[PDB]
Amino acid sequence: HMISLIAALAVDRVIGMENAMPWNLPADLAWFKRNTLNKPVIMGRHTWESIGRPLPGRKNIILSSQPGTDDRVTWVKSVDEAIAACGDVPEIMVIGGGRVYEQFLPKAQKLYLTHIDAEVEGDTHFPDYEPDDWESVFSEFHDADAQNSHSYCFEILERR
Ligand SMILES: NC(=O)c1ccc[n+]([C@@H]2O[C@H](COP(=O)([O-])OP(=O)(O)OC[C@H]3O[C@@H](n4cnc5c(N)ncnc54)[C@H](OP(=O)(O)O)[C@@H]3O)[C@@H](O)[C@H]2O)c1
Ligand SMILES: Nc1nc(=O)c2nc(CNc3ccc(C(=O)N[C@@H](CCC(=O)O)C(=O)O)cc3)cnc2[nH]1
């Protein structure tokens, strides 16, 4: 009934390098937690492998073209199967990675983005979300501090 993408972006909207995350910002991941819990989460098979354990309290739906390899989650073969597998919920969280984010952006009505002031070379990037289609409805800047080496910004965008 409603799809959101939730993603932490560095410069160039880098989200993934060597299939990891080199921007140790704990308030950046504590932001993922306030926004994803009790909502179903959709992710691609690579993002599933990097969490290594379902997100608790939540239907975990993992897109892959091949049979599943973990009974603790729900395996689906298409974007529409992934959505249906989430049930009748007010909001579905799409949590990556690159390929899954791109497929779900046209279906999304909300984006929850952390922008981190960090240079990381990056093979994988968040999809280009046109400003004409998205409106910033929340935005809070934070300088680097004791826990965060990087300056960062939590943002919430709603589809126009
Ligand atoms: N910073 C962030 O916000 C964020 C979010 C998550 C992860 N990441 C990074 O993003 C990268 C991962 O993204 P990725 O693109 O590498 O892999 P992914 O998007 O996590 O999932 C890729 C895999 O999902 C499956 N898949 C996706 N769409 C499908 C579809 N429509 N039908 C069937 N199967 C489908 C395929 O698995 P098969 O090959 O089995 O078909 C595909 O190989 C990593 O670098 C990760 O660290 C960052
Ligand atoms: N805002 C935001 N920040 C992120 O770091 C992020 N990461 C992903 C995909 N990658 C990951 C990697 C690790 C964990 C993770 O370990 N989180 C656990 C514990 C809570 C925490 O560590 O913050 C979880 O319960 O989801 C989640 C997503 C998707 N959306 C995001 N969104």
From Swiss-Prot:
DHFR domain mapped to chain residues: 2-159
UniProt binding sites for NADP(+): 8, 14-20, 46-47, 64-65, 77, 96-103
Result for mutant: M21 to I/V: Increases catalytic rate 2-fold
InterPro entries the UniProt entry points to: DHFR, DHFR-like_dom_sf, DHFR_CS, DHFR_dom
Reported effect, C153S: Increases catalytic rate 1.5-fold. Increases catalytic rate about 7-fold
Top-level taxonomic group: Bacteria
Protein name (Swiss-Prot/TrEMBL): Dihydrofolate reductase
Gene Ontology MF terms in the entry: dihydrofolate reductase activity; dihydrofolic acid binding; folic acid binding; methotrexate binding; NADP binding; NADP+ binding; NADPH binding
Reactions performed catalytically: (6S)-5,6,7,8-tetrahydrofolate + NADP(+) = 7,8-dihydrofolate + NADPH + H(+)
Effect ascribed to mutating C86A: Decreases catalytic rate by one third. Increases catalytic rate about 7-fold
Stated consequence of mutating E155K: In strain: B[MB1428]
Impact upon substituting M17 to F/S: Increases catalytic rate about 2-fold
GO CC annotation: cytosol
E.C. designation(s): 1.5.1.3
Family from the record: Belongs to the dihydrofolate reductase family.
Note: The strain K12 sequence is shown. Strain B [RT500] is resistant to 500 micrograms per milliliter of trimethoprim.
Record note on what altering M43Y does: Increases catalytic rate almost 2-fold. Increases catalytic rate about 7-fold
Gene3D superfamilies in the record: Dihydrofolate Reductase, subunit A
Alphabetically ordered keywords of this record: Antibiotic resistance, Methotrexate resistance, NADP, One-carbon metabolism, Oxidoreductase, Trimethoprim resistance
Effect of M93F: No effect. Increases catalytic rate about 7-fold
Pathway assigned in UniProt: Cofactor biosynthesis; tetrahydrofolate biosynthesis; 5,6,7,8-tetrahydrofolate from 7,8-dihydrofolate: step 1/1
NCBIfam families linked: PRK10769.1
